[PDB]
Amino acid sequence: SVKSEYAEAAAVGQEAVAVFNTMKAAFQNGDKEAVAQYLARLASLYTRHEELLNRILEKARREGNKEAVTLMNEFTATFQTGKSIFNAMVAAFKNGDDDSFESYLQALEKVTAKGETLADQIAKAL
Numbered sequence: 029s030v031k032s033e034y035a036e037a038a039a040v041g042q043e044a045v046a047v048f049n050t051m052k053a054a055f056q057n058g059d060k061e062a063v064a065q066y067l068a069r070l071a072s073l074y075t076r077h078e079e080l081l082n083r084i085l086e087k088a089r090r091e092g093n094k095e096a097v098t099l100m101n102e103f104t105a106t107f108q109t110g111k112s113i114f115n116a117m118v119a120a121f122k123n124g125d126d127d128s129f130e131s132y133l134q135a136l137e138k139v140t141a142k143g144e145t146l147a148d149q150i151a152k153a154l
């Protein structure tokens with residue numbers, strides 16, 4: 029169902045939250061080799077997350093679930109913001125620039141926290 033696929037998407041999103049917090053600790057500790065691996069894992073998880081979100085939105089469209097489509101359009105828009113910030117964070121890591129990395133890390137936390145109001149509304153609309 030669209031709802032079980034949303035539950036999987038929610039789980040993959042929580043996996044990313046878990047890995048992101050482990051990465052933040054590693055960055056603070058200066059374990060750059062660990063950060064590199066966590067960043068690669070996060071990219072993989074965001075790819076899978078976005079794939080699930082798109083299939084859910086396309087299915088809500090085919091089902092005519094107008095409230096769900098509206099909410100998912102809003103959420104997938106904010107997901108792109110998070111993606112853009114994550115990409116800039118990765119570039120800052122490649123460049124050896126911890127100041128910018130810190131800033132982007134913090135910004136991505138705020139984009140994600142703000143998104144959770146939408147995420148929970150979608151669950152209840154589907």
Ligand SMILES: CCOC(=O)c1c(C)n[nH]c1C
Nearest residue numbers: 041074107110111114140143
């Ligand atoms: C960086 C891509 O991910 C996200 O933006 C995201 C996740 C994961 N959960 N909520 C949001 C807005």
